[PDB]
Amino acid sequence: QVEIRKVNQDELSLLQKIAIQTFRETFAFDNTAEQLQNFFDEAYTLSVLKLELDDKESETYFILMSGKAAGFLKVNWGSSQTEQVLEDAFEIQRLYILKAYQGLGLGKQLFEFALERAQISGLSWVWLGVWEKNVKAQLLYAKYGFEQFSKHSFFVGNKVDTDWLLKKSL
């Protein structure tokens, strides 16, 4: 019953909807509505998502359950990567599954699809960022063969944090 394919040009509003809903589900319990809205207002307007859909060096996919969008995947290469950290590299930037569809294995299936796209790309590396404190995710990524190669620290108010960058040889 499951399909994975690129977002259609005529599904821009649908994409905005699921992107907003998943962000709300992931972040709403620990942040205020206004804080979340600040992010929507910047990252998930129809015009920004439109540029992303038209970007030649990026792809956005839906994973679907019986024809209904259950989650989405954004991948980047070339100048569209969020950061230039490796040569001949492919970035997995976004992966969200709607709560109503979690626990069904769809996340794993979409992540595995992302790795196969990377393989088919003929590039040398696939990479992603993970929070220094998210050990569970780290462990999971390590099982697919990802390894740390760099990091980026920054601060918010009084709190300093770090992201690790992990790569997998293609």
Added chain:
Amino acid sequence: SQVEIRKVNQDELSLLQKIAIQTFRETFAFDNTAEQLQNFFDEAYTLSVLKLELDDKESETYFILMSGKAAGFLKVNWGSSQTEQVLEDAFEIQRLYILKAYQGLGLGKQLFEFALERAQISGLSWVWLGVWEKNVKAQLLYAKYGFEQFSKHSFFVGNKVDTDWLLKKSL
């Protein structure tokens, strides 16, 4: 007075690294672990990164000195050296730290006012800086010099979403 403000000398690179590290430690050490701070030092405050900064034609770094001793520092940017391209013909105040042993003497205000005058002399149209949405005290202070919000940037760390406001002042 006993106070001087001037560019960091080429032969003061190590001095700069020292004060940059010490001020960061003073500002952040009570709420973060030593390892977290070291991650930042290891990336931002190595001699080689600071060297590129000192050699950068579109940026300046200044010491404020008290009786010949470095008490704090100031980094300003323009052109492509700005941390973000958000305005045209703009000048950025990126870093300003005063050593704790020298706080409360008015040196911060004096260095910020020096930064605004450099901006004026630059002939550019705007001076801007970023401030944390939650730092109301700083907001209020900035507003007194004539800064106004014009944009913002949200991001997330783990489970927490945050926002920075960008403020500009007409030159």
